[PDB]
Amino acid sequence: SMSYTWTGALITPCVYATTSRSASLRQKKVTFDRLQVLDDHYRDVLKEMKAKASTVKAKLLSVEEACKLTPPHSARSKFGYGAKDVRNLSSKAVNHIRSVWKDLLEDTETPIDTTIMAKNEVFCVQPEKGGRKPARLIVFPDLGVRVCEKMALYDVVSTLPQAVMGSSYGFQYSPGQRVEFLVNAWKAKKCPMGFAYDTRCFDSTVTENDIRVEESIYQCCDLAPEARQAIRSLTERLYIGGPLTNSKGQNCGYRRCRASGVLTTSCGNTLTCYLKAAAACRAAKLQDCTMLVCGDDLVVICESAGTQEDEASLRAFTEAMTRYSAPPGDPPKPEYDLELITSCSSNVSVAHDASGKRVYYLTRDPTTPLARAAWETARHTPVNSWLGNIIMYAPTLWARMILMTHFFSILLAQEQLEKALDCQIYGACYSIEPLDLPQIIQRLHGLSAFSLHSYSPGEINRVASCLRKLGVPPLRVWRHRARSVRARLLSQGGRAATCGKYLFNWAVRTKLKLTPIPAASQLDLSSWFVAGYSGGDIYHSLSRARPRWFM
Ligand SMILES: O=C(O)/C=C/c1ccc(NC(=O)C2(NC(=O)c3ccc4c(C5CCCCC5)c5n(c4c3)CC(=O)Nc3ccccc3-5)CCCC2)cc1
Ligand SMILES: O=C(O)COc1ccccc1C(=O)Nc1c(OCc2ccc(Cl)cc2)cccc1C(=O)O
């Protein structure tokens, strides 16, 4: 069937930023017919996946538990209540939610309505490698449906992918654990070969059968009868497809592929990508495969069979994925160095700690992170990508010297160090105070993230070249600025001094000892690197469970 059909009604609105203008160009690419042919490898992998799902027991979340998971700036319902009413458990919100739930149990076939919208993302043009990227599309149900999805499937999408995929499930890893996983997998091979597989419009490649196969994996869970019916009903009425409405309420057409803004998007895409990839590994006869999957993002680390043989197996893997309705964007290329693999926009690099020991870390080209931070400094934004990049890329040269220095000077000038800000980690929203950054960093990357040096020449040059192309002052200027930022932070004591001492120890002439932060243990990060929730509409506020009086 067609991934999408359109009426003609426009997708209306609600260093460039992506707009609803370019939505017409995106529609053309994501609109096609799917031809999927399944085989014995696919059927075998599926049965193996279902046997592991059979060990999962999932709980039905209460209305209150589901309401607490709703982000405060989550789109309001078309039925007279918003995200604040949901979080406060107002009678109107709760009554509406309970009737939407009852309707999921009684109606098994009527397609649920969704809103289509062009996502606004900040990119960096540079007319040296083509032109501007068209806006991505976001398809999501009403607020009431979104709360019901959490009641029925929040525990499923948080527990099941790990039980099914094991160590291949990428969202269970902090950046430090992701690093450790890839390094260990690379070292486990006699002669390693690795590749990244990029699918062309993954959401659009997802067929109705893929969505039903995904439900067959969920149905293997021990579930409450009502959860079981809600999964069945949500699959038919929402997940498989349904009508699309623009921001103006006009009928835009119809979808028969994956919706980007449903709770099961990340889980479903990870399960589908893993299933198709593991099956294709068998068709291509790749030896001792190690996969790492985050939605549509796949990395394969395997045993090399020779330069000509690896190229042949990669074309075979591609032919199999294409048959499964997952053709590539860019053709995959075999890499024989771990650093040469770019997965989830990131690559492995090495540095040294204070005692000269090797430390592997994840980094990426810093153009987009810096362009986005520049946009966010210029105008007020709901999500601060700068904060997420400080969190995820804390050991990197660019995040330490530029992002930490720039944003801590602004927070110092605005006296906003204690003000909690929202950031997105694995598709989920987190309300974090900048003053908690040293404890967060120690927990995800280790105490060494504050003492890293001996960066590679390639990494230094990439960062340096990037600062030049963007008009950012050189690294020597940042060192000077960090010294004042650090001095002012130290003078304030408490968590602010810890920000000075730990985040800016790289800037001082004579470096400090740096002992573990005692209050880092009491930080509750149990909901952090568990699962992916892209378009899932998930919120968590950071908690410091059991505080000592002297901390
Ligand atoms: O010794 C030498 O040889 C050269 C010395 C030298 C060169 C330039 C400066 N610049 C400045 O002082 C000013 N800008 C900055 O001190 C500045 C700070 C952050 C900047 C950023 C980002 C960096 C990441 C966090 C968010 C801010 C960008 N740009 C920045 C400029 C340059 C800019 O204006 N815009 C962009 C656009 C895209 C990407 C980055 C930028 C402030 C007043 C005048 C301009 C200072 C010293
Ligand atoms: O790494 C990037 O360039 C963007 O990643 C981020 C940076 C800051 C804030 C959030 C993200 C993020 O959650 N990224 C994601 C991801 O990363 C997987 C990974 C893990 C650790 C590192 Cl160091 C790099 C990549 C896998 C799948 C989906 C997403 C998502 O966008 O929701």
Curated annotation (Swiss-Prot):
Residues 192-310 form the RdRp catalytic domain. It catalyses: RNA(n) + a ribonucleoside 5'-triphosphate = RNA(n+1) + diphosphate. It is found in: Host cytoplasm; Host endoplasmic reticulum membrane. The N-terminus is phosphorylated by host PRK2/PKN2. Mg(2+) 2 binds at D198, D296, D297. It is a single-pass type IV membrane protein. Binds 2 magnesium ion that constitute a dinuclear catalytic metal center. Its cofactor is Mg(2+). It comes from the Viruses. The modification Phosphoserine is found at S20. Activity is up-regulated by PRK2/PKN2-mediated phosphorylation. RNA-dependent RNA polymerase that performs primer-template recognition and RNA synthesis during viral replication. Initiates RNA transcription/replication at a flavin adenine dinucleotide (FAD), resulting in a 5'- FAD cap on viral RNAs. In this way, recognition of viral 5' RNA by host pattern recognition receptors can be bypassed, thereby evading activation of antiviral pathways. This is RNA-directed RNA polymerase. The chain holds residues 2420 to 2992 of 3010 of the full protein.
